[PDB]
Amino acid sequence: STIPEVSSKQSKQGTEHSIGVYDRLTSPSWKYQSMVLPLLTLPEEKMIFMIANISTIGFGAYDRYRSSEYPKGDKLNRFVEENAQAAAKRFRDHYDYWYKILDKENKEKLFRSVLVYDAFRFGNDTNKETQEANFETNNPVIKNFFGPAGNNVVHNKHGAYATGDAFYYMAYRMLDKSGAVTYTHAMTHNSDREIYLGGYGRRSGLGPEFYAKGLLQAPDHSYDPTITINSVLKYDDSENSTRLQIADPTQRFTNVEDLHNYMHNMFDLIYTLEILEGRAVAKLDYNEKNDLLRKIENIYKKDPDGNSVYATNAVRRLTSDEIKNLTSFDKLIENDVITRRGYIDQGEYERNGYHTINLFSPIYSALSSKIGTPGDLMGRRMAFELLAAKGYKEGMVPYISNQYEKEAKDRGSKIRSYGKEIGLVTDDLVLEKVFNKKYGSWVEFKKDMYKERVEQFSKLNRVSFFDPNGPWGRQKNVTVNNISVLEKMIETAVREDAEDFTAQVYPDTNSRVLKLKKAIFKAYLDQTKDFRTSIFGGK
Amino acid sequence: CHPRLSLHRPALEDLLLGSEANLTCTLTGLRDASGVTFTWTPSSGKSAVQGPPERDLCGCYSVSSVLPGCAEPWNHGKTFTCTAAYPESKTPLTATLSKSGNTFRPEVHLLPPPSEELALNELVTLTCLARGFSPKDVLVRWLQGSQELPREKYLTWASRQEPSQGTTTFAVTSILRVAAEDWKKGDTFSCMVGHEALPLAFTQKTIDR
Amino acid sequence: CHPRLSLHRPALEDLLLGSEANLTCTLTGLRDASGVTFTWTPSSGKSAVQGPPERDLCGCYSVSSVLPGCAEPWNHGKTFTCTAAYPESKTPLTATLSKSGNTFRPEVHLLPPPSEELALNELVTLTCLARGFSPKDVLVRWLQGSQELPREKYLTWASRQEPSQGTTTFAVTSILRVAAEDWKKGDTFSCMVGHEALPLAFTQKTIDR
């Protein structure tokens, strides 16, 4: 690892700290230590490659990556060496970032040993067909190593799945970038209760996929306009344009306070953008306001238990009384309105679903469940907002860790699930805990955040920017100095967006407001070297 | 085609000159047959007339409804809400129409032709100015004496937002071309303007040499 | 969606004020991504740039091209023909643009506000007339002394067919609001009118009390 301290801890042979493959395989707590002999008596030809890490051990066959136009030989060897080294460095960078972030002395639990596999789908020299293996094929790789290392994989149709103590690539491939992204997702699945959270388990209602895709995972691309932290992979190859993310994860983050400051300032920008969009939306006709906004509801469907606590977020078309009540910006938070731009769905966002959160789509709703499950989209949004307001250790983790479950159970809220009694922690309880007495209800907390952001950009804002995004006519200079011009442009863009919203196929990426928001975000992210402080200067 | 339901205000000629106003709730993007319903919340003694499907952009069928005799309900102040159900999706799309408040009485300013145009005396560029009105629906036409000139005989621009502070009024200008001898002869030319904001709904500005 | 290709002239500001004209070749109805080839027949010292795709109605993906520095070829008289080949059909569509013949010099007639409007003296509504030009591309502004007023401070109409015999000319009108004090004091008002047919490309009409 990059940090000299863990490098010193790893260079020594000392168990529970050594990076050495042999020390890990020999020592207990390794599921299949039967690999040690076949991995030592392989026939001389190079068949398999191993990628080690501070927390994981990688296994893969050369035949996995062999292809039609890509046959065996020296070129296969060179490609495999280069990408194995690159993937090992990326994995090391990801776990170095996590080691920096964890400071509750839970970082000492990162020295575990977990194995990952490739897909056993070896390619041929003639055609790009990765035929499977079933411990009986004649490929020497499974004859020599994978066979004797006895463990069967279910061979799922698609998707690299985690088990709980191990992992196996199924559809992706560990050398590529998507390999690293799915690797971060996989380790979020595998190290969730003990490592990423401070020994506290998952929230009583939320499933394993809640923590996987929406948060605690690297963005699927650099394009992705989603609130997430680029943790594993770095890139500066013509990707500077439309980055919308962090270029250097191993350099941007040093400790918890840096991550908290970065998230806080990104939310400082996003709150200003949301405030401008909401102010524009408030002064609108009935039909446009109806077609441009929705409402989010909590539906307590019947659980796979005797309980009904677990809530499911559902988005429904809002009614006439609500839209009549929406006379100004501040009422938007009151009536729990969500924009249609990125959340077009009119059904339900089912629990345990791969739901992300859009960056430029405002969610004015401070909705929280009076029962102890907040749902998926509201869950992720509130978790990120809390991470912005308060650090990683207090906030976010208390929001979703069952950390207060013991105190909630002490206060009451007893419940029985899967034949055993267990405590139940509720949104109001965590709100009272993380903020001792500062906020009475979540609506007040959201309003206070918006208000403080309002005076914050009232006092300060940066001077020079070039985010024109006009017509095909050459327009380059806008030099937004006071946010009044930004608000005027946002309002004009919203009024324009009130039309041309009757598209069968493409009603979203043709929206002017999304492009303007993206331009503003990119200009502000590039102007500051790191994210640093968004609104700086004056006025 | 994803359908959407919209409402259109009645023509100002129907609103003013027409005894019974027809108000329309058209539906576009219907990618199926005419298995649709057109429901009007204010049932002020009117029936929803349904027509045959019409091919919209890329050939999508479009079905429309008409609520005739809407002048009295409009005079009654009742706002219209139109709800429709279509076979493609269960959810019913809704559109709402309401009275446009804060209307402004237009002002008419007849513009005599300039001296340079009058100096040529080949033709006179008779011009009229309609200004100071909130709604965008204004009927403008040129009147010669007591005889209304045909629409092809004069030229007029569409209404647009005018530069103003606070009040969002609109302006309209019209141009008429006729022989210079008629103006000098003594026969005057009139600018006849109609707008629903005025209780009389009409204003005339006339001048001659 | 049916593919459709067309050519568009550079903006009149680019045509007259702009040193390098940017002429547009746009394609609509392409049911796929930007796997298209755009070729200009008069590609004399110019580079074709294809930018982001613009999604039109009904999901028909559309992309366009820009030809910078076309002012000299436009002054050279070389017609611009654009050929587009798209993955949907092997046959490449072709679009042709040629110089607009029979250009007519506009006349600018500054109309003082009417006496009735001047009688109120609260605000005088200056009127500018742009008439008599075959091409439909005319730029009009209002000039206050030596300072040009912002476009948001005045309203101007668009080109439209006018009733004329033989020659197909167009007429545009511009309007402006200002107090009578400046008109009475001596501060004159200028109407800045530009058109490509004029060799000087600009005609100014100014008057005051």
Author numbering:
A (entry chain P): 1663 to 2201
B (entry chain B), C (entry chain A): 242 to 450
Show passages lifted from the paper.
Many invasive bacteria block the initial mucosal host response during colonization by cleaving host immunoglobulin A1 (IgA1) via a bacterially encoded IgA1 protease (IgA1P). Third, all M26 metallo-IgA1Ps comprise the M26 region itself that is responsible for IgA1 cleavage, which corresponds to G. haemolysans IgA1P residues 907-2201. The two histidine residues of the HEXXH motif together with a conserved downstream glutamic acid coordinate a Zn ion to polarize the carbonyl group of the substrate’s scissile peptide.
The catalytically impaired mutant of G. haemolysans IgA1P-E1848A was used to trap the enzyme in complex with the substrate IgA1 to compare its structure to the analogous S. pneumoniae IgA1P-E1605A/IgA1 complex previously determined. Our purification of the G. haemolysans IgA1P-E1848A mutant bound to monomeric IgA1 resulted in a highly pure complex amenable to cryo-EM analysis. A cryo-EM single particle reconstruction yielded a 3.5 Å resolution map that facilitated model building. Only one of the IgA1-FAB fragments is visible, as only one of the two hinge regions within the intact IgA1 is cleaved at a time, as steric hinderance prevents a second IgA1P from binding the other IgA1 hinge. Although most domains within the G. haemolysans IgA1P bound state did not incur large changes relative to the substrate-free structure, the NTD2 does undergo a conformational change. Specifically, the NTD2 repositions 4 Å relative to its free form. Thus, while the substrate-free G. haemolysans IgA1P NTD2 is already 6 Å lower than it is within the substrate-free S. pneumoniae IgA1P, it still must undergo a further opening to facilitate IgA1 substrate binding. Specifically, the conformational changes in NTD2 by the gating mechanism in both metallo-IgA1P complexes results in similar conformations within their bound states that is in contrast to larger differences observed of the NTD2 within their substrate-free states. Arguably, the most important similarity between the two bound metallo-IgA1P complexes is that the bound IgA1 hinge region and the conserved HEMTH along with the downstream glutamic acid motif are in similar positions.
